[PDB]
Amino acid sequence: TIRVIVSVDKAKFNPHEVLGIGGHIVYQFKLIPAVVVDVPANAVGKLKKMPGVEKVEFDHQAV
Amino acid sequence: TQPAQTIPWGIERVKAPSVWSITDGSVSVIQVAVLDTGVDYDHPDLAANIAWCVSTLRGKVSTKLRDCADQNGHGTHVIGTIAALNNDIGVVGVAPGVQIYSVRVLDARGSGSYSDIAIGIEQAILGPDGVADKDGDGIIAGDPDDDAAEVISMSLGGPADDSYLYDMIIQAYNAGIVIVAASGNEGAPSPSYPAAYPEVIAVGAIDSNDNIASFSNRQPEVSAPGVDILSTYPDDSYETLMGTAMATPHVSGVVALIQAAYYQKYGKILPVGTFDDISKNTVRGILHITADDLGPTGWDADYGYGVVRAALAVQAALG
Numbered sequence: 001t002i003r004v005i006v007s008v009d010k011a012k013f014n015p016h017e018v019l020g021i022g023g024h025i026v027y028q029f030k031l032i033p034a035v036v037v038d039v040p041a042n043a044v045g046k047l048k049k050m051p052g053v054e055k056v057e058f059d060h061q062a063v
Numbered sequence: 064t065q066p067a068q069t070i071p072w073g074i075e076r077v078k079a080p081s082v083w084s085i086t087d088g089s090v091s092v093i094q095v096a097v098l099d100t101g102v103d104y105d106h107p108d109l110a111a112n113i114a115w116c117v118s119t120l121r122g123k124v125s126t127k128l129r130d131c132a133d134q135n136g137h138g139t140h141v142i143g144t145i146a147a148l149n150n151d152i153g154v155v156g157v158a159p160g161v162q163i164y165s166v167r168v169l170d171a172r173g174s175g176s177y178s179d180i181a182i183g184i185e186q187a188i189l190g191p192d193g194v195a196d197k198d199g200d201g202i203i204a205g206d207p208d209d210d211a212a213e214v215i216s217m218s219l220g221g222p223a224d225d226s227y228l229y230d231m232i233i234q235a236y237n238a239g240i241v242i243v244a245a246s247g248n249e250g251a252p253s254p255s256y257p258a259a260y261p262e263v264i265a266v267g268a269i270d271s272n273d274n275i276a277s278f279s280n281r282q283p284e285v286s287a288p289g290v291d292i293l294s295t296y297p298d299d300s301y302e303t304l305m306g307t308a309m310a311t312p313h314v315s316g317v318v319a320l321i322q323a324a325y326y327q328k329y330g331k332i333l334p335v336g337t338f339d340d341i342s343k344n345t346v347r348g349i350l351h352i353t354a355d356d357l358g359p360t361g362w363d364a365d366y367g368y369g370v371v372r373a374a375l376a377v378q379a380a381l382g
């Protein structure tokens with residue numbers, strides 16, 4: 001699994017449907033239209049075409 | 064048993080003690096959110112200023128103490144620089160009476176993910192009541208009806224830019240909240256993110272001879288004491304460290320003092336201001352024009368505007 005952050009269109013995107021591609025929801029932001037999701041490394045391309053998905057961004061580490 | 068109080072040189076350097084007769088930061092509406100490794104929450108020289116203890120590690124928001132405690136020391140040290148109490152023991156912070164929201168976004172290693180950090184910012188904005196703007200008036204930082212922090216302090220950074228992190232920083236900026244971040248420790252030509260956003264004050268590090276530290280990422284917005292910094296450290300102890308992580312809380316303590324002294328006098332807080340600002344009408348304008356202008360005149364790539372000075376910033380704010 002990798003963890004990505006999906007920018008979403010609220011009125012096209014369904015958090016329950018990331019299961020369709022092997023995914024699950026980690027955290028839905030309240031203040032920004034984005035969601036942290038865990039997904040198979042090879043589902044990122046599928047995730048990118050999911051309805052309501054506007055951008056897929058990857059997680060990074062800070063020191 | 065606890066040592067007798069000392070004033071770390073960095074506190075003296077940013078001209079904090081002369082403010083404390085006006086305010087030590089303990090104006091009710093003011094809170095500082097420290098996004099870090101957590102906090103030694105029973106530390107005798109910190110306990111009384113910890114108003115809220117949250118954790119966002121692994122995407123999972125927790126108010127449990129197992130989860131909120133410092134397993135590293137980094138957050139305990141940083142927090143002590145802002146807010147170690149003015150009493151008979153240990154050390155003393157820039158704003159030794161300010162309330163702290165310790166928001167644990169970094170793990171036992173002092174390392175953390177962008178997504179936990181972005182959740183951390185949202186949590187600083189939402190406050191313990193889990194609502195940003197409870198009365199729907201548009202005022203969040205400085206509204207005494209809400210519980211948002213007025214300052215977000217981030218002794219962390221990374222080389223990557225993302226719109227999710229960026230949008231969270233716009234949310235905090237728009238909430239009226241002063242954002243402070245370490246410029247980074249790579250000796251690089253420019254700051255790490257989020258310090259590098261125009262919404263965020265990038266802080267660089269000086270040593271005790273007023274030289275910029277060799278590791279300090281350049282092009283900060285201001286600079287502050289960041290080498291040989293004595294502060295609090297687990298368990299119920301003290302340690303001396305260096306890094307822009309140490310410089311950043313000095314600048315957050317100064318900001319809390321401005322906002323706390325301004326509120327106390329006017330019953331409102333100052334606007335955040337811009338990276339460019341040179342007016343006396345915003346927190347950042349005041350920070351710029353009252354900074355000790357070291358090196359080349361005006362903004363320079365080593366020190367930014369100069370070393371922040373609470374005593375003049377606050378005089379200018381009430382002026």
Ligand SMILES: [Ca+2]
Pocket residue numbers: 103104105106298299
């Ligand atoms: Ca302790």
Ligand SMILES: [Ca+2]
Pocket residue numbers: 068108147148149150151152153154155
């Ligand atoms: Ca003390």
Ligand SMILES: [Ca+2]
Pocket residue numbers: 188189190191192193194195196197209210211
């Ligand atoms: Ca709130």
Ligand SMILES: [Ca+2]
Pocket residue numbers: 195196197198199200201202203206208209
């Ligand atoms: Ca409000």
Ligand SMILES: [Ca+2]
Pocket residue numbers: 198200202206207208
């Ligand atoms: Ca209000």
Ligand SMILES: [Ca+2]
Pocket residue numbers: 092093094204205206209210211212213
């Ligand atoms: Ca507040």
Ligand SMILES: [Ca+2]
Pocket residue numbers: 356357358359360361362363366367368369
């Ligand atoms: Ca200069």
Ligand SMILES: [Zn+2]
Pocket residue numbers: 001024026038
């Ligand atoms: Zn998962």
Ligand SMILES: [Zn+2]
Pocket residue numbers: 057058059060223224225
């Ligand atoms: Zn990225």
Ligand SMILES: [Zn+2]
Pocket residue numbers: 063137173218306308
């Ligand atoms: Zn660090």
